[PDB]
Amino acid sequence: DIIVVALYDYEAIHHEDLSFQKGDQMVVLEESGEWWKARSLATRKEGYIPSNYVARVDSLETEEWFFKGISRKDAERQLLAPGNMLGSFMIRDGSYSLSVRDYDPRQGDTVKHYKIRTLDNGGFYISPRSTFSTLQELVDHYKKGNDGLCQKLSVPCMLE
């Protein structure tokens, strides 16, 4: 049984669709096309759902850029290991931090740390100049250009 969880609320209008609230778990029944047939675990109600509104429960926190529960000190050490490049990075932890490998011709290799804050509405930001609805969008943004960070993000920190 493939279990997914809702990331957003969805209100069904079509009588064959399935309504759900963020956090609801569902079993995927049919997975053809981008509209999946699913059943709610709580209620047993079935219907079609937008596939981009859910994530596999076993996929949670497996993002390549995410480094679960590790300290600031450990993040620096790992990022500073040879094999990592300019702009190598980590997101680490509701409260998140971005750690980025930097270079300066005088100081050499360093790691900069940025607090990722959240607004009351839940949006993520490092700077008041841009806000993101998800951490993934934040990562994708700073991979496009430094936009105020020490470096443009390149690739996730190498695992050891």
């Binding site: 957003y8 079509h14 064959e16 509209w35 937008p50 596939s51 981009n52 839940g122 609805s133």
Partner: protein
Amino acid sequence: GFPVRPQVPLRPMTYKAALDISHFLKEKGGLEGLIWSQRRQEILDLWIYHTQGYFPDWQNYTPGPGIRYPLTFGWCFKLVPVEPKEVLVWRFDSKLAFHHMARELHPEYYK
């Protein structure tokens, strides 16, 4: 709540979908009795596209003058002139679920 629910995947308009959206919007607080405008229709169509995934090229009506009938069988709203260009009001008509008026008036639209 948050984050705002995003764009859902695209899917084609059907009789069944148009009928369900019709009955949804006929309920108090919806579309019934509102004066039509291009801007209001576009806002509605964007909302349907964003939240339900139907590309916004389905809500067309027969040309004036007089009552404008929906080109998409299953869409049960028509635009009715306010008698005083014409001022038009969205009106739900349950009979449109079974009678494709637009096709009867303009069969040339459906070759």
